[PDB]
Design a protein around this motif. Structure first.
Motif, PDB file in Angstrom:
ATOM      1  N   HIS A   1     -12.406   8.439 -29.690  1.00 38.05           N
ATOM      2  CA  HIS A   1     -11.440   9.431 -29.241  1.00 38.05           C
ATOM      3  C   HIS A   1     -11.254   9.712 -27.751  1.00 38.05           C
ATOM      4  CE1 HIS A   1      -8.702  12.591 -30.647  1.00 38.05           C
ATOM      5  NE2 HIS A   1      -9.405  13.809 -30.164  1.00 38.05           N
ATOM      6  N   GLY A   2     -12.324   8.967 -27.348  1.00 41.16           N
ATOM      7  CA  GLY A   2     -12.635   8.880 -26.005  1.00 41.16           C
ATOM      8  C   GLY A   2     -11.598   8.003 -25.061  1.00 41.16           C
ATOM      9  N   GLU A   3     -10.714   7.401 -25.496  1.00 48.41           N
ATOM     10  CA  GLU A   3      -9.783   6.310 -24.925  1.00 48.41           C
ATOM     11  C   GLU A   3      -9.585   6.942 -23.512  1.00 48.41           C
ATOM     12  OE1 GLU A   3      -8.797   7.786 -28.262  1.00 48.41           O
ATOM     13  OE2 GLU A   3      -6.635   8.147 -28.174  1.00 48.41           O
ATOM     14  N   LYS A   4      -9.188   7.977 -23.424  1.00 47.44           N
ATOM     15  CA  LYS A   4      -8.596   8.861 -22.221  1.00 47.44           C
ATOM     16  C   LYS A   4      -9.427   8.570 -21.020  1.00 47.44           C
ATOM     17  CE  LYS A   4      -8.863  12.412 -24.958  1.00 47.44           C
ATOM     18  NZ  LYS A   4      -8.306  11.477 -26.009  1.00 47.44           N
ATOM     19  N   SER A   5     -10.934   8.392 -21.125  1.00 45.60           N
ATOM     20  CA  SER A   5     -11.717   8.264 -20.195  1.00 45.60           C
ATOM     21  C   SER A   5     -12.094   6.797 -19.592  1.00 45.60           C
ATOM     22  CB  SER A   5     -13.085   8.783 -20.546  1.00 45.60           C
ATOM     23  OG  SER A   5     -13.756   8.277 -21.577  1.00 45.60           O
ATOM     24  N   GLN A   6     -11.717   5.829 -20.642  1.00 45.06           N
ATOM     25  CA  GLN A   6     -11.551   4.333 -20.319  1.00 45.06           C
ATOM     26  C   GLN A   6     -10.797   3.989 -19.146  1.00 45.06           C
ATOM     27  OE1 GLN A   6     -11.663   2.890 -24.977  1.00 45.06           O
ATOM     28  NE2 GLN A   6     -13.362   1.868 -23.731  1.00 45.06           N
ATOM     29  N   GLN A   7     -11.017   2.750 -18.536  1.00 41.54           N
ATOM     30  CA  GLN A   7     -10.410   2.764 -17.250  1.00 41.54           C
ATOM     31  C   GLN A   7      -8.920   2.014 -17.531  1.00 41.54           C
ATOM     32  OE1 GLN A   7     -13.967   0.007 -14.907  1.00 41.54           O
ATOM     33  NE2 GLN A   7     -12.177   0.616 -13.753  1.00 41.54           N
ATOM     34  N   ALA A   8      -8.161   2.885 -17.148  1.00 38.54           N
ATOM     35  CA  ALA A   8      -6.751   2.693 -17.093  1.00 38.54           C
ATOM     36  C   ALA A   8      -6.279   1.325 -17.386  1.00 38.54           C
ATOM     37  CB  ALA A   8      -5.851   3.471 -16.220  1.00 38.54           C
ATOM     38  N   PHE A   9      -6.423   0.419 -16.191  1.00 38.13           N
ATOM     39  CA  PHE A   9      -5.792  -0.805 -16.208  1.00 38.13           C
ATOM     40  C   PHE A   9      -6.449  -1.803 -17.386  1.00 38.13           C
ATOM     41  CE2 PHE A   9      -8.608  -4.582 -14.773  1.00 38.13           C
ATOM     42  CZ  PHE A   9      -9.710  -3.619 -14.594  1.00 38.13           C
ATOM     43  N   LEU A  10      -7.788  -1.536 -17.875  1.00 40.41           N
ATOM     44  CA  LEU A  10      -8.317  -2.231 -18.651  1.00 40.41           C
ATOM     45  C   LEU A  10      -7.694  -2.205 -20.054  1.00 40.41           C
ATOM     46  CD1 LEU A  10     -11.738  -2.486 -17.791  1.00 40.41           C
ATOM     47  CD2 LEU A  10     -10.451  -4.336 -17.898  1.00 40.41           C
TER      48      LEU A  10
ATOM     49  N   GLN B   1       9.012   7.617 -17.019  1.00 37.75           N
ATOM     50  CA  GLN B   1       8.331   9.096 -17.043  1.00 37.75           C
ATOM     51  C   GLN B   1       8.042   9.707 -18.130  1.00 37.75           C
ATOM     52  OE1 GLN B   1      10.578  11.763 -14.034  1.00 37.75           O
ATOM     53  NE2 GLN B   1       9.000  13.128 -15.213  1.00 37.75           N
ATOM     54  N   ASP B   2       6.825  10.269 -17.994  1.00 40.32           N
ATOM     55  CA  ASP B   2       6.239  11.302 -19.049  1.00 40.32           C
ATOM     56  C   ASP B   2       4.867  12.036 -18.614  1.00 40.32           C
ATOM     57  OD1 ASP B   2       7.693  11.653 -21.974  1.00 40.32           O
ATOM     58  OD2 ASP B   2       5.496  12.020 -22.204  1.00 40.32           O
ATOM     59  N   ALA B   3       4.598  13.010 -19.325  1.00 46.82           N
ATOM     60  CA  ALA B   3       3.764  13.763 -19.176  1.00 46.82           C
ATOM     61  C   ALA B   3       2.404  12.988 -19.741  1.00 46.82           C
ATOM     62  CB  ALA B   3       3.901  15.239 -19.777  1.00 46.82           C
ATOM     63  N   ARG B   4       2.810  12.340 -20.809  1.00 42.55           N
ATOM     64  CA  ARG B   4       1.744  11.632 -21.475  1.00 42.55           C
ATOM     65  C   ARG B   4       1.094  10.491 -20.715  1.00 42.55           C
ATOM     66  NH1 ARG B   4       5.603  13.275 -24.997  1.00 42.55           N
ATOM     67  NH2 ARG B   4       5.089  14.090 -26.866  1.00 42.55           N
ATOM     68  N   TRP B   5       1.868   9.900 -19.578  1.00 44.88           N
ATOM     69  CA  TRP B   5       1.447   9.011 -18.669  1.00 44.88           C
ATOM     70  C   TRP B   5       0.109   9.553 -18.204  1.00 44.88           C
ATOM     71  CZ3 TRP B   5       1.707   4.193 -17.112  1.00 44.88           C
ATOM     72  CH2 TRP B   5       1.283   3.921 -15.864  1.00 44.88           C
ATOM     73  N   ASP B   6       0.442  10.804 -17.855  1.00 41.76           N
ATOM     74  CA  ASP B   6      -0.517  11.476 -16.938  1.00 41.76           C
ATOM     75  C   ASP B   6      -1.827  11.814 -18.030  1.00 41.76           C
ATOM     76  OD1 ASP B   6      -1.858  13.811 -15.674  1.00 41.76           O
ATOM     77  OD2 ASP B   6      -0.981  12.667 -13.912  1.00 41.76           O
ATOM     78  N   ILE B   7      -1.379  12.620 -19.051  1.00 39.18           N
ATOM     79  CA  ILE B   7      -2.056  13.033 -20.148  1.00 39.18           C
ATOM     80  C   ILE B   7      -3.339  12.017 -20.640  1.00 39.18           C
ATOM     81  CG2 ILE B   7      -2.134  14.005 -22.362  1.00 39.18           C
ATOM     82  CD1 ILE B   7       0.376  15.753 -21.171  1.00 39.18           C
ATOM     83  N   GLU B   8      -2.751  10.948 -20.746  1.00 33.18           N
ATOM     84  CA  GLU B   8      -3.517   9.956 -21.099  1.00 33.18           C
ATOM     85  C   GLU B   8      -4.049   8.988 -19.973  1.00 33.18           C
ATOM     86  OE1 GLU B   8      -4.403   9.266 -24.776  1.00 33.18           O
ATOM     87  OE2 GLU B   8      -3.494  11.313 -24.074  1.00 33.18           O
ATOM     88  N   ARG B   9      -4.521   9.738 -18.918  1.00 34.84           N
ATOM     89  CA  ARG B   9      -5.241   9.380 -17.654  1.00 34.84           C
ATOM     90  C   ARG B   9      -4.772   7.732 -17.199  1.00 34.84           C
ATOM     91  NH1 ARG B   9      -9.697   7.759 -17.644  1.00 34.84           N
ATOM     92  NH2 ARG B   9      -9.924   7.509 -15.200  1.00 34.84           N
ATOM     93  N   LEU B  10      -3.571   7.543 -17.584  1.00 33.74           N
ATOM     94  CA  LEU B  10      -3.033   6.112 -17.110  1.00 33.74           C
ATOM     95  C   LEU B  10      -2.678   6.498 -15.696  1.00 33.74           C
ATOM     96  CD1 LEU B  10      -0.934   3.907 -19.656  1.00 33.74           C
ATOM     97  CD2 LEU B  10      -3.489   4.174 -19.242  1.00 33.74           C
ATOM     98  N   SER B  11      -2.497   7.516 -15.150  1.00 33.69           N
ATOM     99  CA  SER B  11      -2.139   7.665 -13.798  1.00 33.69           C
ATOM    100  C   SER B  11      -3.568   7.758 -12.889  1.00 33.69           C
ATOM    101  CB  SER B  11      -1.332   9.006 -13.488  1.00 33.69           C
ATOM    102  OG  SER B  11      -2.088   9.975 -14.423  1.00 33.69           O
ATOM    103  N   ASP B  12      -4.671   7.580 -13.584  1.00 30.57           N
ATOM    104  CA  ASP B  12      -6.021   7.424 -12.967  1.00 30.57           C
ATOM    105  C   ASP B  12      -6.096   5.887 -12.619  1.00 30.57           C
ATOM    106  OD1 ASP B  12      -6.032   9.901 -13.837  1.00 30.57           O
ATOM    107  OD2 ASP B  12      -8.164   9.945 -13.710  1.00 30.57           O
TER     108      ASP B  12
END
Ligand SMILES: [Cu+2]
Ligand SMILES: [Cu+2]
Ligand SMILES: [Cu+2]
Lengths: 100, 390, 390, 390
Positions: free
Chosen positions: D1-10, D340-351
């Motif tokens: 459930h931790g997908e959020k924290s894994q490195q975005a580009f990977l 564009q979507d809040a999800r892009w940010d909410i799923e830490r893909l903006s990291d």
């Protein structure tokens, strides 16, 4: 002592070894006699590839392969020497101990 | 010869051996028989075994009962390590000159880098003569000949045994010149110094001077004889060329395709029953005639009405059957194949129940009306039937 | 520049270098020359050398005598590691801005992961100007410019030397405040405690409180300047696109095919004689005009009547010949090729007799009536002829 | 459930996940829901992650809230490790029997050998019932059934607890028979010998004789019950069969081709702007309808007028747009896409700004007039725009 021991090794083997580093042409390929003695007299469990002999690298420069090997063998034999001297000593121990 | 003890499933799912032939099952010392054959590198290569990217072809025999004169695989002269690609077939051969009188059981053999030995089939090979008579020989680049059986052994002893004698002198000298107990005691008391001190050290510096001299001499001489010399020739050979004829698994426009779809072998056993989803794919009607496992052959006596020349041992006549109903062309058919023979048990392939992968491997051989053979690879999970009767 | 010393066989059987060009063999400081070319990843890649799955393209030059502004290979901007596939050709180029006044001998260069450096050809490149005048510069994402030659080096010293001085204070303080011999002697006797005890410890706790403070400050400041920052960008680039033009080994409908079939080089030497089973395969008659080895060119003066622009050194006019009898199309012909030049000895390629793999590698160039060039790869075991005399 | 924290580009440039479906978003204990989907193995596989040559399919779930009954990938039953080829797509499915009552968020998951876990999409899955009621069961080869939830636990305790009790006897015995302090003191003084000496040793020799006998018995018994038994079955599975329908990246005569050609995301962000050099290549006009990243969907509401059934969370309706100008057949067009979507940010893909490879990955979904979906892989370097904000 060990630096000599290191350097003299290949020199003192050459006499018995040279004879087998004479070149032969086999099926359009070059082999040394040695390679061939190996290839001929079949060992059940000894595929060339197990060998661990020189195979070339890009960081070889020369024409130097044996000198460097021997000097290296010399300098390292210094350390082995010490350790094994003091182990020769440890093994010479007349210490008697009281229980097991 | 130990093939029996190797893990059953591994023998079956690595190298698939076929058409192995021995030139002559008798030779004179110096007479030059040849062992040859073809091998298919199984497609689902097991985890247990290194990838065969690095392999080496060999004559499985109890030491040099035959010299090997040369060998070839994938259409290359292969006295060094070579790559085998998963899924392909390679043809090989080994030129074997008789050497030692007896009755040896000589095998085709390939070893994989981090895998170990894979033994093919073997045939007994009666040699006669006297070993005394065996020669090589071999020709140098300078054009001269040398008998290898003997060449160089003289020169070796010539250098080795002198020095061993020298070494033994050095010891017996100091020993009988100042004993063990004597010199121990000396050392144990004050001195020491009685035991050594020059000119014991004169002896030393001289003995040393002669040693180094003996070396510079021995070197320069053996540098004069043999002033050519090259380094040992080693390393992985250029990629091989597989077999393209015809076919020959996944080669050509026409071919058979076999899926495994369930198996069952009895434990203990002699029997294997498998359902095979054949497709064909050729343009001739095909009857399945043979199945090979670890060099074991299983023949359909409907197809092999006779009855090939092939070591016992090894060669079964119960790889049967179908309803002899030739299938295609185009036809896709699932066909129960029974394989039964004492050899399956005798070759410890029934000890597949002991393995960590209860899985079968091997080649299927379909034939047309005429000769034409079409080969397809068969593999996958087979289940044991645990039967009573010990 | 040490290419001479590398193992002959390896240089020949790894990277096959061709069409190497230097924009300008003179530059001013800040003037922007470019080095480019193409390379064919030999097919039978040696054991000795890592698979080139991981490699890096480089300008072989004695330090930053030219800054590199960019570089590309396989149609990618390649400032990081890249895969080269065995058998393929890639084209590359390196954009080099003059920087240091002199006469440097700049090379094409690729390094393999666990292999080492492979040096291409090299050309002398006269630079002139004053180093003082060299700039970069470079543009950030925020839009601003920085001269790299200088950027940052201020701020560094700013932070390094203060702290070095501080460190030195701390030492010189306690040194002259209780000497070595004094404090040794104190400690050596009962005490000790005379040497330290607070408020030596108050100095401590204070010097420490300032240190940490100095750190939190320096941090928060340098965090304000540069409040953006990203981590170093590293890792293997997406796979390259090879050259598809035309051809260009094993590309297109038409091509030449050369098998090596026997070779001989003299030892010591200058000469190599090889029998080449050429097939063609095109639809024009083909004359063999060039042979490349380690960047060494061997030209047929029949085909190269003139006579290309290419660093000495390096470029021979005795890669001859045939019977100039253009072969095909369709024609399959075995053709003695003599290669003779002092360059083959001068580039230590005659020291192939020293190597553990007596074997040749490289590209053969066939030409049509018109210009059209057709490239085939050549390689395999050559034998030495051991000759007397100078 | 931790997908959020894994490195975005990977998460973006490894496994590309699509058409994931859950049989039922509610089940009873013992009721048998199934999770399925397809995955495309990105083509420019990052250095950071082992090659997926060894992978394993999994139900990402907080322990055995659902037993897994079976699973399949690449058209194989995959309870063991399997190979995934870079650039291909595989289809999978997992058969999940409810077990523990609650509301779990269940994922598709695959792990790579030297890589770690890659988490697909996950959907909440309300289970109801009482765990007390959960069973398996399972059938032996001998034909009998066993409830796995309980099977064997009896027999285990039966052997463990007795021995633990035996162990505790042995200790309490010697302890209260000769104290700690008593026996310390005895030993500390002369003896010792008071503390042991036979017939303390008679006790020992006896206790041991019983122990070994207890073993030979327990062995022979448990050898009579269960006289069959096979070793654990392990190892990498035969190669998978990829999806060939239709298509499905680089499969079939018709297809789309997308290059990335510049990208920009805002930092901090919600936005991504990319220029895509599409080619098509089909024979229908194509509209771009979806873009997937880490299980995140970005939809063109022009194409997804409605509006799929897919966990929240996860599913965006702003993957827009083009000028809805269907492109081809034949047409090659570079087209600015805004995501564009809040999800892009909410799923830490903006990291992605934090990563050591500022690079994007994923699949593009073009549709024809009718339903027909055409898939192409997009990937490569996107630049951050550093905007004012937190
Ligand atoms: Cu045998
Ligand atoms: Cu140079
Ligand atoms: Cu989750």
């Amino acid at each position: 002592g060990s630096l000599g021991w290191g350097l003299l090794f290949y020199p003192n083997n050459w006499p018995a070894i040279a004879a087998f580093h004479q070149a032969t042409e086999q099926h359009g390929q070059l082999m040394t006699l040695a390679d061939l003695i190996g290839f001929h007299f079949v060992r059940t469990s000894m595929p060339e590839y197990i060998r661990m002999v020189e195979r070339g690298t890009l960081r070889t420069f020369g024409k130097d392969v044996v000198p460097v090997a021997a000097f290296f063998s010399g300098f390292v034999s210094m350390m082995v020497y010490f350790l094994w001297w003091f182990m020769g000593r440890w093994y010479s121990t007349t210490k008697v101990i009281d229980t097991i | 010869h130990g093939e029996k003890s190797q893990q059953a499933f591994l023998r079956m799912r690595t190298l698939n051996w076929y058409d192995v032939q021995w030139s002559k099952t008798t030779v004179n010392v110096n007479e030059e028989m040849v062992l040859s054959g073809k091998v298919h590198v199984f497609s689902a290569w097991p985890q247990a075994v290194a990838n065969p990217r690095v392999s080496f072809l060999n004559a499985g025999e109890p030491g040099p009962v035959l010299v090997r004169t040369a060998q070839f695989i994938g259409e290359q002269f292969a006295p060094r390590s070579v790559s085998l690609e998963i899924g392909k077939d390679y043809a090989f051969s080994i030129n074997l000159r008789g050497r030692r009188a007896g009755r040896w059981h000589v095998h085709a053999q390939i070893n994989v880098e981090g895998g170990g030995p894979i033994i093919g089939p073997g045939q007994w090979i009666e040699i006669k003569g006297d070993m005394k008579d065996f020669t090589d020989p071999v020709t140098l680049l300078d054009g001269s000949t040398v008998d290898l059986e003997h060449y160089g052994i003289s020169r070796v002893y010539a250098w080795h045994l002198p020095w061993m004698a020298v070494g033994a002198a050095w010891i017996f000298f100091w020993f009988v010149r100042k004993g063990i107990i004597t010199s121990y005691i000396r050392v144990a008391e004050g001195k020491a110094d009685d035991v050594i001190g020059d000119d014991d050290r004169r002896i030393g510096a001289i003995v040393l001077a002669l040693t180094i001299l003996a070396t510079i001499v021995g070197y320069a001489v053996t540098n004069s004889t043999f002033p050519r010399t090259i380094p040992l020739q080693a390393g992985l050979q250029k990629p091989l060329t597989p077999i393209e004829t015809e076919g020959t698994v996944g080669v050509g426009k026409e071919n058979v395709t076999t899926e495994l779809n369930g198996g069952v072998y009895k434990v203990p056993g002699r029997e294997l029953t498998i359902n095979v989803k054949v497709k064909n794919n050729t343009s001739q009607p095909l009857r399945l005639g043979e199945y090979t496992a670890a060099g074991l052959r299983f023949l359909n006596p409907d197809v092999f009405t006779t009855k090939p020349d092939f070591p016992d041992y090894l060669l079964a006549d119960r790889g049967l059957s179908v309803d002899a109903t030739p299938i295609a062309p185009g036809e896709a058919k699932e066909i129960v194949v029974k394989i039964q023979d004492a050899r399956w048990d005798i070759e410890r392939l029934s000890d597949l129940a002991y393995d960590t992968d209860s899985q079968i491997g091997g080649l299927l051989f379909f034939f047309s009306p005429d000769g034409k053979r079409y080969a397809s690879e068969i593999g996958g999970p087979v289940i044991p039937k645990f039967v009573a009767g010990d």
